[PDB]
Every structure is written in C-alpha cells, then in structure tokens.
Amino acid sequence: SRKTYTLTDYLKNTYRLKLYSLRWISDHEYLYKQENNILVFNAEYGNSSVFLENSTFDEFGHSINDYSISPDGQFILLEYNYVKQWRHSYTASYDIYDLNKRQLITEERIPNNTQWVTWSPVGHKLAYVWNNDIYVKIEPNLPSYRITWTGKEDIIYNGITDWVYEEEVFSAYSALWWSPNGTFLAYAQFNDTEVPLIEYSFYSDESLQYPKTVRVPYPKAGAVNPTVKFFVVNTDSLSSVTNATSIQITAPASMLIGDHYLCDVTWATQERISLQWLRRIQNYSVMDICDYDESSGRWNCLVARQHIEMSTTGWVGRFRPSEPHFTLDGNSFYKIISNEEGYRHICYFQIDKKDCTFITKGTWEVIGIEALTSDYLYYISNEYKGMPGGRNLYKIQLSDYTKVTCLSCELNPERCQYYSVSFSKEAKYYQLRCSGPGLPLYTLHSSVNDKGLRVLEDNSALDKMLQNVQMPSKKLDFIILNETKFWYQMILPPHFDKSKKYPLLLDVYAGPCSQKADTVFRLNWATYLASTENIIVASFDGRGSGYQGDKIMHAINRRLGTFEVEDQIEAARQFSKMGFVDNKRIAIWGWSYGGYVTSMVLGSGSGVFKCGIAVAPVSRWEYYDSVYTERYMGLPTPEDNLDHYRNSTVMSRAENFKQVEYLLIHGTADDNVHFQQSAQISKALVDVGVDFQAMWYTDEDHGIASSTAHQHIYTHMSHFIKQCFS
Amino acid sequence: SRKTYTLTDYLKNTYRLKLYSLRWISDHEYLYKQENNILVFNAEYGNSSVFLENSTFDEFGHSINDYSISPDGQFILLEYNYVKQWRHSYTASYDIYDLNKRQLITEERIPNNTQWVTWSPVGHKLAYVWNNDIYVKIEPNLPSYRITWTGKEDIIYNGITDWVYEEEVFSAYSALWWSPNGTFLAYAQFNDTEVPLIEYSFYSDESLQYPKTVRVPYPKAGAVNPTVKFFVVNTDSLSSVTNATSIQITAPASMLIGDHYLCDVTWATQERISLQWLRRIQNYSVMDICDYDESSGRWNCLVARQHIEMSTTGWVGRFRPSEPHFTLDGNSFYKIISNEEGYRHICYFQIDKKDCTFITKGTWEVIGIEALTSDYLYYISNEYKGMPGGRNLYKIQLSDYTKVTCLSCELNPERCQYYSVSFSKEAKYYQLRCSGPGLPLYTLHSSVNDKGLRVLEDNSALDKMLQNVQMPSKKLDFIILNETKFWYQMILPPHFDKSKKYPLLLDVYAGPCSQKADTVFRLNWATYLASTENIIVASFDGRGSGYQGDKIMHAINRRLGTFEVEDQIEAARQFSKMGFVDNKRIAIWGWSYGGYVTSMVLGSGSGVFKCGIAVAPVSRWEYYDSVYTERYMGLPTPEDNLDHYRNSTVMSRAENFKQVEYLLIHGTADDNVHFQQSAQISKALVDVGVDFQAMWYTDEDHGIASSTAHQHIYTHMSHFIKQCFS
C-alpha cells in the first residue's frame, strides 16, 4: 500500500518529534523557549506573559546559542561563539543583559574563549573559568576577582575537568560548586603534569597545507593518572587587594595511601559539604562530611562522619558512587546503594551513624532520587510490572515506609511506560516526560495531592503524519538462560508474518550496565530497516547488563569480552530457533563498546553470523582510558589482571574473520576511542590475509555526528547490509 | 584448455624472472653473485675461479644483505643490520673483511646506524656518514678522521640528502663525491632549520600503547626550502690533530639572488669539478667548472667557464638537468640537452666556448650517454623504427658524426626491442640487457669490434614453464590526435577475438615525462587480469608524456591536471570505438600521480567510466612537495600560478562522483604523498553526499610494498574490479 519509513526520512528528519523543554525559575513558574521568545508560565493556571521579546536580540549582532537567567530574575546570560570541544566541554563568548534597565552591560565583560560560566544559586554572583583559572563576579558590571593563579593549558585545571574526568567521572566540564546561599565557592584542581598525551592528525579545511597534530592528556589503562586537589573559598570576604585564600580540604587517609579519584561533591547546608573519593581500584569509596569552622577558618572532615561504600563482587555504583540527598537540616541523607540481595535501593543515613536503613526493597532497582520534601521522597524505578525496561515515578512517605504511591504508572498504561520528571524549586509542581512505547507525552502536575493539571505536548501532529506511513511495531520480552530471565526487543516490519523467514540484524551495546531492551519510542535507522527493508532489528541485554541487580551486572567483573559476547551469540541462536528468522541471514552491528562486542562475536567462529559492522570499536583494553577500563578490568599488570587484558583483544581473533563479511568504520579525529584501535584491527586482518571492508571518516570524532558524515555513514551501512541480505 | 596466469601467481611469484646482475671490478673481469658465492669471471673467455667462498660467512653471525669490494681488490665491505628509511635512504652496520689475510678487521670499525659508506674510486679509502657528519678512513684498520662537526638530526645534513633532495633532485641518500684518484672528497651540506615538518601517526606492533608521531622536514609547494652549501676537502693532507679544512665553493651569482638548488656534481679531472645549480623557478640552470688552485688552496669557478641551460617553453631537463660527460683531458664534455626542434640530443661542448655542437639530431630522443672512449660515444635512444617505447645501444664515431652504428637493434629483433647496458672499466666489454617484448635476454660483447662473445642468461627455464600457460599478448601502436601520433599499449587476453566485446581497464600514470606505452616484458597484475579474467588492460601516453620531444612533454607546463587527464579520457573514447570493447564496462586505475589522474578523470563527468581505483593519489598540488610540484606548476602565489593550483584539485570535482564507483586506498604512513591527500578527498565526498569505497593500510608508505599488504591490496582491488565488471 502507502509509503514506508525511508532512509531519507531518518536522515532528513522528516518526522519531527516535539518536546517540551521548560526550565523552572521558581516554585510557581517556568520559562518555555521557542524559536521566537522566552515566555514565562504560571504552573497553577497556565497563563503566560512573554518573558523577553524575540525582537530583543535580532539586532544583537551574533547567533545566540543559549540563554541562562540569574535566579534573582534580574539578569540574562547570553551564550554565543560556541566552540565544541569534548562530549560536554566547549568554549564560548558571553554578555550579561540587565532585564530591569533593558540594557546590555558593556564594561568588565566576561572574556571570550571562556570555558565555563555559572550563576550562584541565589543572587546574581558569577563564577567563570578562563585559561584554566577561576574568576568571580559579585556584580555583573563590576570587575572580576581572580581566585587561582596556576592555570596552565593542558597541565593544571582549575574549576574544569581534564579529558578523563570530563568523560569518566563527572560527565561535565564544570568542576566548581557554589554553596546553597552562595557564600562558598568549592572547586577541584586537576594536575596532568605527568599524564601521557594521545596524539593524532587533524586535517581541517582543504586550505591547510600541513595537517595539525592535536595532542591531549589522556591516561590509557595503567598509565599515570591525573592527581586531584579540592578547595573552598569565601566569596564574601574577598577584597580586590589581598589575592584571596582558598582553603584546601584534603585526604581522607584511606585514599592518600595510593592513586585515587574524587567522584562526587554535594553541598549539604550552608556550611556542610559532602565529598566522595574513590580508590583507583574502584572497589572502595569513602564519603567525607565537612563542616566550616567559624573559628579557625578551615573545614573539619570529622572522622566518624565518614561512610564506606564498597563492593565484594564488583565496582562501586553504576558508573560512579551515587549522589547523596540531604534533608533540610543536613543531619541525614538518602542515597541509592546496593542491597544485601544485589539490588540498588535507597538507604536512609544519619550523618554520624554507619548503619543505614533501607527504605525500599525488592527484585527491581531504583534508578534515581528525583526530589525530597519534608514528608515525601520522589524516585524513578523499574518496579511496575517487573519490567527492567520501564521507568515510573513513585513517592514514598517519609513517616511510613509501607505507603508508596505510583504517580506515573496509570495515567496512560498502553502509551506510557517510560517516564522522567522535572520538579519546581520546592517541588510543588512537576513535569512528567513519557517517552514510549507510544508517542512522547508531556504533562503538568501539582504535588499537593498529585492532581494532573494539564497536557503540555501530545505530539498529535506527528501522530497525524504517522498514520499514512507503515510503521514497524516493537516487541519486548524475555528468554531464559540458566534459570534467569534476559530481556530483549525486536523491531518488527509492518504486516509481520510469523510464517515467513526474515533477515535479522542484531543491534548491540552490551557494555557494563547497559540496556538496549526497553520501552522508549525511537525513530531511528532501525525504524527504516524494518519499515522499508523488512529486516528484524533486535537487541538483547545479557550478562553485565544493568538495572536488574548485581548478580547480572557484575557477571563480567574483571572479565570484559567474555559473557557479554557469549550472550549476544546466545541471543542470536535463540531468535534463529523462533521460526520467523532466516538463519542464512543474521547480521550484527555496534558502535563504541558495541563495535567491540560485534568484532569479538565475528571473530568467535560461532558460524551464526553471515556479516557484521563495527563502528569506532575498542580493540584492546589497554588502548582505552584508565578510569573506565580499570573500573571493570583492574590494572593491566602481572600482579593484577594483565593476563585477561591480553587474552581479550579483537586482534587475536583475526584468523576467524575468514568466515564472515566485516565493515570497519572509524573517524580519524576520535579523541575517545582513538583510531589507533581500528588501525590495529586492520593490521591484524592484513597480516593473516583476511578481506574486509573499511571506511575512515576524516576529522570526525566518536559520534561521527556532523550533518554530512552522519548521512554518509548511514547510507554506507545500509548499502553493506542490503547487499549482505539480498 | 590448460592453466591461466592466476592472481596467486603474481602474488606468490610462481613464475620467476632470471637476471644477470654482474659488477665490473676491472676492464677484464666481473663478479657474478648467486645465493652461494661471489665468483670472478674473465670477460674474454668465460672461465671463473671462485672469488670468495660461500662458507666464509655462514659462521659470520648476521644475515648479510649486501657486499662491496674496494677497487684495490684488497677488501670487501659487508652490509648488514639493514634498516630502510625512504626510497633510497637507509641505515646499516658494516664490517671490513681483508681478502688477503683471510681475516675480519675489528679495531676502529665503522659505527652502526651508519647512513652511508663509500669506497674511494682507486685505493681502499673510506668515506662514511654517521649522525649527519662525515668521517674518512684512509686505512680500514686505522682511525677515522672527522670532517664535519655540525651534524644535527633532521637539521644539518653533511654528505647526505634531506627528504626532498633524496626524492626529487639526487634520487639517492649519498651527497658526497670522490675525485677520480681520491685526493679530494667533495660534499654537499643541507640545512632544514626553517623547513616545516609533516607530521603523522605510526602505530607499530600491537604492544605499543601510544602511537608515535613521526615528523619529517618536508617542504610543501611554496614553503621554506632547505638551503644548500658545497665543500671539498683534501684527504691526503689531514693530520689527526688539526681538525681539517673544508674549502667552500659558493655561488653562482645568478643563483644567489634567490632560492636555488644544487642538482648535479660530476668530477672532470683530478682538479676539475663540475657543478650544476638550478633556480627555484626551474627554468634556468647554470653549470660551474672549478679548478683547484695549487697556490691559494681554494677553488676557482671562473665565469666564462659557466654554461647556461634554459627553457623558454618549460622546465630544464627531464626531471633534472642532465649529467655532463667529460673527455679524458677535461677540456670538453658531452651532455644531453634539448634541440632547437624540441628534441633531446647530445651536445659537444668545449669547456670555454658557449656554442655547443649537436652530434645527433632527429625526431627521436637520446635517453642516456652510456660511455665515452677516445673514438666512440655510446648511448641509448629510441630511434629504431620510430618507436618511442623502444630502447637501443648506438655508437657514434667521434671523428665522423655521420657514422653511427646500432649495436643492439639486430641481434634479435622479434624478441628484443628494449635494451640497457653495463660497461667494463675502460669500456672494453659490454653486457646488454634486453627486456622485451620477448623474455629478458643477457649477453656479453667485446668493444674492439662489437663481437658477440656469449649469452649469459636466456631465461629458457621460464620459457619452458610459460608454454604450459595461456599468457596474454601485448599490442603496441598509436592513435592520431591534432595531427600528432600518441602511443598506447593493450594487454590482450589469450585467444583474443575481435568479434567479442571485452571489459577494459585503463592503467594510467600520465605524470610529466612518463611512458606507460613501451616494449618491456612485464609479468604483473595486468597479466593476471587479462589471462584469468579476460580483461583488456591498456595504457596510453598523451600530452605531457616524455621521450617524444618538448612539443608533447611541455604541453602541460604550468597546467597539471589538464591535457594529461583530457587525453586519457580521449584514449578511452577511441578504444571504445574499436569494436571489441564493451563500453558499459570501461574502468580506470592509477597509483601516485596515476591515482590523481584517475580521480581527476572520474570527477570530470565524462560518462565513459563505470568505476575506478585511486591508490595513494595526490589530491591538490599545494600538498605535494616543492621541488617536484614547482617544477611543473610554478609557485602557488597570486603573482604566479595560485589560480590554477586552486582550479585543479580533485575535491572540486567531488559532485561528479555520483556517476561512478570509486575506490580510494592509502597507506597511513605515506611520507611521500601524505595520507592527508586522501583524507581531504573523502571529506569532500562525504560533504556532498557521495558514496565510495575506501581502504586504509596502516603503517604502509607510498609503495604499500610489505609482503602481506601488497597481497591484501591487490586481492582487494581484484574484488572491486571483478564486481564492477561481472
């Protein structure tokens, strides 16, 4: 009949998904963006006077990438000149516009090439980082006070993360934290002095005669890590003549004995800062809780307020130890930690009592703690219907742990089983974001007794477009192995017919704590392959997968490249038994870690897979970075785990690629998984006389995300699959 | 019927071509190597007592890759620890073995990592370069005297060439020249101080954690060139206490006005050194003739001894100004230079008279002056049968220029049309090397009256094997354009049938002064394509091609990427009208410059070519080196030829690759045509949404010549072609 979801569609983005990106500026109001004008909305009723006219900056003289209003309500920060660096890092330019006097602030402006700017959480105080140094701006139109003086490009970082900390521990460039009322500014300092550099060519525009060598501090597994220091400064007692004292918090002694990280910093009260440290062996983590000493002017990290979080069967936390949530007085906190049963749940801690009390339990896990009031703790979890791929909002009554309510489960069960939530400032209102299996739906609620105020975005437009196009359907379900359920999804072509045999693509990640089998509604390349090309795209969450407890997640501890790949092969066989699957036509592909799994599967000699694609794969663990690799693999030394580092490379599997058709893709400017890794793969396959397909993407990093390269690659991959399959 | 010439054959070298590599040690004798033992032969009769036993060095303790006997006859130099650098450069270790006391000399030995070693042309004196400095060894058993003290790695070169001089001017690492009796050692010094570096990753064995950045001094078109100086030292008057005086020859004044090169040095007598220099605009070259002054102890380059060689229609000489050949007394010389008519012929010059006299003329060219006696000058030319693809040996009578004899033309016309020659020390005997169209044939002759002494290698073994296998035949011929003939060859399948339509591959180089249409017998990848796969591989020499005069060769002066690609397009079209050519199946491929012409041709939107392959192409001229690019293109400046530099890139033709199937291959460690060039091509084709195949070869340079990579690339290319063709 009518038209399908085509490749063009995915690349040219013809079927747009609507969102409702709001930002709460108080407990009663938010701003909704546009392409035109920031408007302000009243949560109770829905009325909305325009916040600031779209005309304000047509004759500003620059494209303005981003906006950011001070909490005072008195100023807008204006981001422009944005120059992307890593995943989160970038530089930019900045002007401050005073809402009151409808007037740009021109003197003492924030310098260009600024790495990071942040308001204080109450007033209009500014902290910005520039050339690796921290600067504070008490009033927007007044001068800046320098705070640190040791900023050195590529060497000493003040208030910002180095490459590895950005990627692997904080997930952010920022490494400064204001105190709740803005007296204190706490910051981290990282030292890359002795860290080796990864170096690679960047070619740029045709006009550049000589390729430039980019070089970045980057610790590969086992190499010299960056050192970290931590400080706090009073932003009220700085003068402009005395340079300014930063107070160092040190230790703790359980970390100073050897290599360590700082992995969490969370303010508690005006004068309590909580810090989490984690040993290089990411087995053992400590929480410190330090009060300010009015008297001495230094910070007391009182012994006996410290909290050990360890693991006997793996690493601490999902990717890092969880974040604590402090009650208003700051004398107790909730954080997610692993059960005695293996499951991640909420513990109630009293700041000077080591024995925490679990407030939630069960064979399911808590994803994140969303909000804390005086009577209710708010959280996302996968409890509903026993589906680890579902997400819902719950509240637990702080005075009776038996009384927990689902706030999202029932609003629309057929449409909505994957939720996320955004709360107003004292949590009197919340936006719920449903994201599947039906169309994304955005709605507004008031907390007083969880009354549904109104629908913010229903995507009815998209719904109207998508009824004249033959969409694929999705199936979530589980298969059993060794008395355990393992979840898996399948994207099914339209008019699916279980009496016909279909080609199957296995879409894999399989990295530690991953989940490819869930309820989110996704409009992507798989949608095209199923709808236009009649392929079954399938993903499977085997051992090492997350959100189902530690017996699963920790099965691959110290053993990457074993069960997770044994399980993906396992999945394939199982689907090929299902009757609707032509086993002469199973393929497999993955990006990143998924590339690694794919490669490792193709090299296994399973005989299951006719062909496969690996995009920007890891090829041996020693090439990837310290913080990530070590988390799961330990150190690549004889005394520790060198042996399995060695025994788990793609290269050693070279000879078995004779049995398969392989496509190896990689961007030359990958700062994350260096091209080196695909370079060693090809060298291996050349060395043992195996033919394969390749494609470098010049100057593209780990996302190969540019407009045209994104289109080129997907076009290229479609061609390879279609040929493997027709 | 029987077996064909298979791919495995070409790659595993199953049909071995026998050579006869001899080295003349005198006028009466030569050494023929083996895998066994160096024997000595007498040219007159052919008897041969073993020179030095094979067993002398089995218990040596190192693999011995090369040998070199002092002229004295008293020593052998033994090369080992060979470590390849660029095309000609390499390091090595060396031991000197005294023939007479049957004993290796072990004190004062030549240091390892030696960059170059050379005998004196008479005694047993040694000159060697180590750590960019020159050392002389009067006796092998005695200490070395240092000559230069300014050797700095990649900065100051003494007695050796930097990257660009090695590749583009000298075609050698060597930059010293002994005087004919060995009193004087002349040397060049190059200075790379302010030369930009090309930088790239080399990955090495899998064990290496971080990729190393190789970085080489490399002038791209328009960049800062290396400066050169010239010196001469007397090796009889060095003491061991006074450090040793090198006398510098400078100028000429017509060169010092700007950038220049040194491009030839040839000794004339014991006390005359001839030098050729060439302006950076390679339009205008000067020869200096400098005599040693007994009195002052310096060198007079007396003007009115200098000889200008220029070009009004292009560049000086083929790739460089030709080498002069001095008569015994040193008061006259012969060199090849371009006609009034445009053609390359021999001029007789009297060292202090400007007006040289042509001793040969005609619509053919002289290739190289082979030898000069008192009554005879010997040379190779393509005069026989008007065939620019033929080579033959001629002698011209010095006393009557009308009397010139062909010595090679007639020995076997059917089999032999491509000759080269090696002469004994006073030219009393010559070995002729016939190399096609029949099988390579090696014979010995005596000069006295050019009598054929005997056949040294007929390759009858190879002939016997090759009569069991369906080989392809080859056709040489010409087409006419613009009232000019232009030669072309075709490798034709066995059992060729003009009533059948075959797929055609066009094998292209087409670079300045190239010749792909010739008489040489080649056993390579085209042989397989024609034999096994029934493909016509054809090559064509259009404009810009050499050995046919300057009308042709200089047609692409200041205009690379024009006529040479228009002419390959033109040959294809003409071939496709020939009747036996399926024009739904014409392909094209090239390496280096040929990769560039290939890409340029595919981008042209000709509509002739279904598909193509480019190996390691140039992509825009500003990316390739100064000496070569500028020779043909001038300087990439607004005042000069920037406009056509820009107007002639592959990238700008990106859009047109939508119409073809493209395969782009490049080695990541190409020091010659930097990867950068293919990286910019792929970027352009991604930018405009054009699909193509690629393959990088990690750590392979311009030859992609290592055993495994060679095999992999040709296999990969046969797959692409087979597919484009069935």
Ligand SMILES: CS(=O)(=O)c1cccc(-c2cc(N3CC[C@H](c4cc(F)c(F)cc4F)[C@@H](N)C3)ncn2)c1
């Ligand atoms: C006759 S001589 O005195 O020994 C003698 C003296 C000087 C030079 C040369 C000579 C050089 C070359 N080349 C071959 C073409 C090479 C080339 C061209 C190109 F377009 C590329 F992209 C890459 C590449 F390697 C060129 N770099 C050297 N060929 C022949 N002769 C020879």
